């Protein structure tokens, strides 16, 4: 009987592929060939942040574009001031091997987790003035890879259990569970409207899920290796994914197929982080070659290179306003380029 | 803007306090030695953890040897896809890889060999030393002494293998048990010595689940590792 299901899945995949090919009347590269190239931009590090002991693994810019949060595997979550570089808070994490961090839009709460399979929340604006654990989400059966805040009460988290979870911080329970991924989920990305989110699960494929409906609304299978980075396009209709194959791939939610690919022959190492600028014209992807490549979102060419880090790049974040971009690496130093 | 300058001074004082905290902590961390305990499911790693300690995805065991703090981390309750999270333990002092030598037939020894090879060849682990604990030597001895579990039936090369000259057999141990032990050791030695030099080293130690001296061994190994990392400083 399993042969019937196998044949049904095969013919459904063939039909979906034929449909995607039928909608491929043109290609983004041939239409963008008329766009003026960005050329070259010599971005330099304007601020250097020092104080982290172990390799930094996660980072997330705040909506205020002033304070930033960085997590190191020494059990430390540091809040830095972008303008003055002064550390605001230094939360000691109960779990040393932290792998994710999220700065709430309002800045009242910050989430972080890791191999402990527990997502701890910390309130930065307690009446006492100190930072204390607010909630503990210990329902996951795997390491927390990435997390992002939808609001002051709802939070999406990705765990090594191959399933994402939307939690209500107030009750501390799984409000919704997203299942379907084959491998371990690595990164998360919240759309501008906070209604849909995408993520890769080490299966060379990404899945767009709806926060309210709680189901895999769409799926993409453009990549060829494990996906480690993902970020929504500023418009919310597309997103770029980075994989260990040393190539970034753009996918549109409406096209249901890959739009373009950014890669180069000399670039053979894996990818760790990817993000878009305010306008989305520049795609900044962090590579294991100790530098970050800024590609043109339309010309598919290397518009810039940030080779200021001496160790692997772990996280990369662009402010909502797009003034500067913070690139963290395993060297325990955060560099803000502008 | 006097208020702005006052806020800046307050933030500078807070940053100085945080720098002191990160300093009194740079001090506690570099003095502590982190270790990653790994091994097959059928291995006696649980017994070793129990002896050393006498829902969470990671368990921590803190123990002091010669006034030196060692934090051993077990990655239990985690999926068997280790290719991703293992990279998180690149800076650990050592990886205590416990393999059951008596678990050879499926053939779990082959799976342990493949896992050790993958760990030794992993890009981000090329600078991390691996302490190989060939655990459950009593079971291997009992099986090879009085038993029909012929090793050549699962390792044809064993038919041509002979005890080396540098072998230090235990007083009273049967020559066949020593031969099997040193063969299982060379099985990992061939893998560890072909893709490593001046980056990471393997420390094979014949141990048992109930042996306490294992702790000491780790300590010893740690010293070696550290010393060797110190020798690297003398290279301009």
């Amino acid at each position, epitope marked *: 009987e399993l042969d019937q299901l*196998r044949q049904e899945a095969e013919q459904l*995949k063939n039909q979906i592929r034929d449909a995607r090919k039928a909608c491929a009347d043109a290609t983004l590269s041939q239409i963008t060939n008329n766009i003026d190239p960005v050329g070259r931009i010599q971005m330099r590090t304007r601020r250097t942040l020092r104080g982290h002991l172990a390799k930094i693994y996660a980072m997330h810019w705040g909506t205020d574009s002033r304070l930033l949060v960085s997590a190191s595997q020494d059990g430390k979550l540091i809040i830095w001031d972008s303008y003055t570089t002064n550390k605001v808070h230094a939360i000691p994490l109960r779990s040393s091997w932290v792998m994710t961090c999220a700065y709430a839009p309002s800045g009242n709460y910050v989430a972080c987790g890791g191999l402990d399979n527990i997502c701890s929340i910390y309130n930065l604006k307690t009446r006492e003035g100190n930072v204390r654990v607010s909630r503990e989400l210990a329902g996951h059966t795997g390491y927390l890879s990435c997390c992002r805040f939808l609001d002051d009460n709802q939070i999406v988290t990705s765990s090594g259990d191959t399933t994402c979870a939307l939690w209500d911080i107030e009750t501390g329970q799984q409000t919704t569970t997203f299942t379907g991924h*084959t*491998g371990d989920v690595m990164s998360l990305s919240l759309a501008p409207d906070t209604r849909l989110f995408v993520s890769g*699960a*080490c*299966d*060379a*494929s990404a899945k767009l899920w709806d926060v309210r409906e709680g189901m895999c609304r769409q799926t993409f*299978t453009g990549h*060829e*290796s*494990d996906i480690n980075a993902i970020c929504f396009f500023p418009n919310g209709n597309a997103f770029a994914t980075g994989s*260990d*194959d*040393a190539t970034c791939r753009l996918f549109d939610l409406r096209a249901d197929q890959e739009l373009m690919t950014y890669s180069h022959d000399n670039i*053979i190492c*894996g990818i760790t982080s990817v993000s878009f600028s305010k306008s989305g014209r520049l795609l900044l992807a962090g590579y294991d070659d100790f530098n970050c490549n800024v590609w043109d979102a339309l010309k598919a060419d290397r518009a810039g290179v940030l080779a200021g880090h001496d160790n692997r790049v772990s996280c990369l974040g662009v402010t909502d306003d797009g003034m500067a971009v913070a690139t963290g690496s395993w060297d325990s130093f955060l560099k803000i380029w502008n | 803007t006097e208020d702005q300058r006052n806020e800046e001074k307050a933030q500078r004082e807070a940053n100085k306090k945080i720098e002191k905290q990160l300093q009194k902590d740079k001090q506690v961390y570099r003095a502590t030695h982190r270790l990653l305990l790994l091994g097959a499911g059928e291995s006696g790693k649980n017994t070793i953890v129990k002896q050393m300690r006498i829902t969470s995805g990671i368990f921590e065991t803190k123990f002091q040897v010669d006034k030196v703090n060692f934090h051993m981390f077990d990655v239990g309750a985690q*999926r*068997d*896809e*280790r*290719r991703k999270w293992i990279q998180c333990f690149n800076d650990v002092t050592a990886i205590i890889f416990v393999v059951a030598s008596s678990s050879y037939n*499926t*053939n779990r020894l*082959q*799976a342990a060999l*493949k*896992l050790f*090879d*993958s*760990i030794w*060849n*992993n*890009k981000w682990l090329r600078d991390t030393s691996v302490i190989l604990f060939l655990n459950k030597q009593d079971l291997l001895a009992e099986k090879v002494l009085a038993g029909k579990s012929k090793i050549e*039936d*699962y*390792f*044809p*090369e064993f038919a041509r293998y002979t005890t080396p000259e540098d072998a230090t057999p235990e007083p009273g141990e049967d020559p066949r048990v020593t031969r099997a032990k040193y063969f299982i050791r060379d099985e990992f030695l061939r893998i560890s010595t072909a893709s490593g030099d001046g980056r990471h080293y393997c420390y094979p130690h014949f141990t048992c689940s109930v042996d306490t001296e294992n702790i000491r061994r780790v300590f010893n190994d740690c010293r070696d590792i550290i010393q060797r990392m110190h020798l690297r400083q003398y290279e301009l």
Partner: nanobody
Amino acid sequence: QVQLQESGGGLVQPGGSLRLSCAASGFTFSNYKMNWVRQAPGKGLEWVSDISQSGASISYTGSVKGRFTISRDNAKNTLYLQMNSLKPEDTAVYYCARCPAPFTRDCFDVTSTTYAYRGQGTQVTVSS
């Protein structure tokens, strides 16, 4: 999407010979190391053999050395496993596994859980 289609397996008597063939698609077959593993009835995944990218480095398990031959052809993205002499204990479902990442030699495809880069496998049975 990554796709691996195994075929060539079937019934055989003791001492027979088979030639399993795995057709790959959805990636650069030459940039990844290939492996053959097997799962016996009522048993876990067992690694059989491995062949590197260029096809120079080859390895087999102790119970397979000098009995099976692994090979690859990057000109068509295909893998081959010639079984010269089989035995009853060889009955199993054979799977073809690919290296997790390219330009690497550390494999973690022996995972018991569902591996995202393995084919459906081919059932081979040997009986007198």
